[PDB]
Amino acid sequence: MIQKTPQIQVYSRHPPENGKPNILNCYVTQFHPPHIEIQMLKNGKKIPKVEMSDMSFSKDWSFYILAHTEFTPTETDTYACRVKHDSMAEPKTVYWDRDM
Amino acid sequence: SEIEFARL
């Protein structure tokens, strides 16, 4: 067997602006095997409507997929994306940073 | 159009 640790980016589709609808993305790439569980959270509580792009793999055999949800950021809300993959002991959580 | 793959 072989296992590639997913790399995770968390960002909005448009520049974050308090009080205005947007789309938060969770880009997961460089993972193998393809089975992967991606959860998007809000202040710790799992977000329901979480759309996931079809899966694909790049030249190096590893897989990538994009998960996204709508959301209207605010000054204090916290968002994060959680990924559980066979390549890691515990799930990985990446928090959303506005300036990234 | 794709090709028909042989077997390993």
Binding site: Q9, R13, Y27, F57, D99, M100 | S1, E2, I3, F5
Partner: protein
């Protein structure tokens, strides 16, 4: 410019959960245009690029039945590899393939591909010479002698030089307009105060396409590629891509730095600086 038609095929055995998940995806110039998926209602080839709907109900039927045929072979292959690697029939495994052709501006062949991978590790691949194979290990060697015998290298050389290319020309003809599309990036610079007396200058490039792009920071005309942090180009979700690069400069010396954005969509590279609101 050059072009290419490649197919990215994946078969994942899901012991217990049911039959293996087969997913075939065709790319033209690195742009998905078709896709098959067994784990779908009634598996059929569906267009991924609007310009593919120009193909009649034959193509699809013909191409779909071929997908189902590769599916089953892949189902067998998986069983076979469990044999080669003496692995239990109760674990999940992955067989991946990249099969395609890259042509030049003349419509000729530049390089054809045909490489397998098992569980994410090169298994076998056709050599650029389109005649001999490169087995990745003991297992692959068995396929290698089988294919040398059957003369697989030739069967593919044939496909790669003809059928592949032929179809590439055919696909382009109805997708050039679209494939050659280009969306220039719109860049800006953000300011973030760091611990002590430093500051971060993050240069943003947005809604650009294709993904290919380069960003740089310069200190009085010199690419600071040493302490510049940058993220990998990422998708916006609407077709375009994003990317930023940043450096940490001293508080007060922000105007001594400038960002440069290089994209094929641009008539000429971009040049920006920190712009504190007037």
């Amino acid at each position: 410019g050059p072009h290419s038609l490649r197919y990215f095929v994946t078969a994942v055995s899901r012991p217990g959960l049911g039959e293996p998940r087969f997913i075939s995806v065709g790319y033209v110039d690195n742009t998905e245009f078709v896709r098959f998926d067994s784990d779908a209602e009634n598996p059929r080839y569906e267009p991924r690029a609007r310009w593919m709907e120009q193909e009649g109900p034959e193509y699809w039927e013909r191409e779909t039945q071929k997908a189902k045929g590769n599916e089953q072979s892949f189902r067998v292959d998986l069983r076979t590899l469990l044999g080669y690697y003496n692995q239990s029939k109760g674990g999940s495994h992955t067989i991946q393939v990249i099969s395609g052709c890259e042509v030049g501006s003349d419509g000729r062949l530049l390089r054809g591909y045909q490489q397998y991978a098992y569980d994410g590790c090169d298994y076998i691949a056709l050599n650029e010479d389109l005649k001999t194979w490169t087995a990745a290990d003991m297992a692959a060697l068995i396929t290698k002698h089988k294919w040398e015998q059957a003369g697989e290298a030739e069967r593919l050389r044939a496909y790669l030089e003809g059928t592949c290319v032929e179809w590439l020309r055919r696909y382009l003809k109805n997708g050039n307009a679209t494939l050659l599309r280009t969306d220039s990036p719109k860049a800006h610079v953000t300011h973030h105060s760091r611990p002590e007396d430093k500051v971060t200058l993050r240069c943003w490039a947005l809604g650009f396409y294709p993904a290919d792009i380069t960003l740089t920071w310069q200190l009085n005309g010199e690419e600071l590629i040493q302490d510049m942090e940058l993220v990998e180009t990422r998708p916006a979700g609407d077709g375009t891509f994003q990317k930023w690069a940043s450096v940490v400069v001293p508080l007060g010396k922000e105007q001594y730095y400038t960002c440069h954005v290089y994209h094929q969509g641009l008539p000429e590279p971009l040049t920006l600086r920190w712009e504190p609101p007037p």
